Amino acid sequence: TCPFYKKIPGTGFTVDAFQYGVVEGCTAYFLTHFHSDHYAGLSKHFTFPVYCSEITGNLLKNKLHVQEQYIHPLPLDTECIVNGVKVVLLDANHCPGAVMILFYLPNGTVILHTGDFRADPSMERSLLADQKVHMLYLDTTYCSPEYTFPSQQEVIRFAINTAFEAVTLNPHALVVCGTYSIGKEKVFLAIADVLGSKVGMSQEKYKTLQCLNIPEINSLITTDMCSSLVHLLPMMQINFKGLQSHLKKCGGKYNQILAFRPTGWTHSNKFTRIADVIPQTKGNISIYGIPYSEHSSYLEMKRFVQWLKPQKIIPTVNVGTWKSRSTMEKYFREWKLEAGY
Numbered sequence: 001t002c003p004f005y006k007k008i009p010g011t012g013f014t015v016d017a018f019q020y021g022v023v024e025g026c027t028a029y030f031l032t033h034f035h036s037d038h039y040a041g042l043s044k045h046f047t048f049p050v051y052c053s054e055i056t057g058n059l060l061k062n063k064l065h066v067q068e069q070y071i072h073p074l075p076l077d078t079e080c081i082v083n084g085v086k087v088v089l090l091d092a093n094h095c096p097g098a099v100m101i102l103f104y105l106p107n108g109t110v111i112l113h114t115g116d117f118r119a120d121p122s123m124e125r126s127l128l129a130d131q132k133v134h135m136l137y138l139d140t141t142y143c144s145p146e147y148t149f150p151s152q153q154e155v156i157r158f159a160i161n162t163a164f165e166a167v168t169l170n171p172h173a174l175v176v177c178g179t180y181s182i183g184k185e186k187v188f189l190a191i192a193d194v195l196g197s198k199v200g201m202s203q204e205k206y207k208t209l210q211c212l213n214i215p216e217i218n219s220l221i222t223t224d225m226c227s228s229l230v231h232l233l234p235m236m237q238i239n240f241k242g243l244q245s246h247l248k249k250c251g252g253k254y255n256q257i258l259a260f261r262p263t264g265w266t267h268s269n270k271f272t273r274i275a276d277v278i279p280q281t282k283g284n285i286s287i288y289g290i291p292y293s294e295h296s297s298y299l300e301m302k303r304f305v306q307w308l309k310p311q312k313i314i315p316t317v318n319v320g321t322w323k324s325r326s327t328m329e330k331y332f333r334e335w336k337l338e339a340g341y
């Protein structure tokens with residue numbers, strides 16, 4: 001059954017709760033973003049109302065084939081009424097179309113559900129600042145002090161300079177970027193822009209990108225692999241074997257590959273800075289691991305929560321074991337004692 005952390009008290013709303021069949025009492029199902037864990041169970045067979053961003057609605061329509069009658073897209077930064085209750089969608093700074101939702105309950109309680117998010121100080125000057133938030137449903141993916149990472153902009157700058165140097169040294173080099181869902185598009189778009197190229201990709205991936213309301217998208221991406229010097233492949237192919245195999249397929253138009261694996265955190269965040277990063281190499285193929293995160297670091301999460309000063313926190317990630325919940329509660333109490341709420 002639907003866990004209490006996916007239910008919004010004193011409404012019949014749920015959030016990211018599609019895998020439990022019909023939820024008893026639920027009149028509106030909210031979807032924060034188009035990642036498979038959150039949408040799990042949604043398909044062309046679903047027949048209840050789904051509320052979401054415009055981008056998330058495009059994806060539901062075109063990729064999952066959910067029938068149009070059941071998709072209720074809402075604009076961002078706008079007070080809207082859903083089944084008699086005031087809501088606002090805010091940018092989550094996660095992947096394209098990802099939202100946080102602000103729910104103003106009839107009794108006067110105010111609840112923020114973050115979805116998946118990367119906390120940022122620009123969120124301190126949104127509609128959130130206008131009133132007290134009593135309850136916070138929090139993306140606790142990286143809720144432990146070891147999880148540090150560079151800014152998105154540091155990582156992109158590194159990627160740009162690396163790619164530009166390699167292709168100026170060898171104009172027959174191909175650049176490959178690995179991918180497994182939506183998110184982290186700035187990695188491949190920024191590399192292509194410094195090389196004066198479009199991004200080449202499969203038909204399924206191109207169809208996904210065509211849903212995302214990216215300005216001038218038709219000038220940036222193509223299904224013609226031949227004509228482009230940046231290619232997208234599934235993350236699972238970003239290894240020496242898969243990359244030599246792809247190089248054989250391109251018809252001797254390239255004689256070297258430079259590949260990037262955008263990952264979350266991995267243990268080598270604890271010593272290395274982005275400027276010290278060096279690739280793994282075997283012959284004419286080099287693979288760079290780059291920690292481009294679309295989740296809050298510990299410090300970013302702590303700052304946001306200390307600013308917001310919620311009366312209660314409801315974790316939404318790593319809640320499956322008592323050890324994790326206990327550890328998280330410890331950090332929430334420290335933050336509260338330091339900040340005086």
Ligand code: NI
Binds near residue numbers: 033035094116
């Ligand atoms: Ni996500």
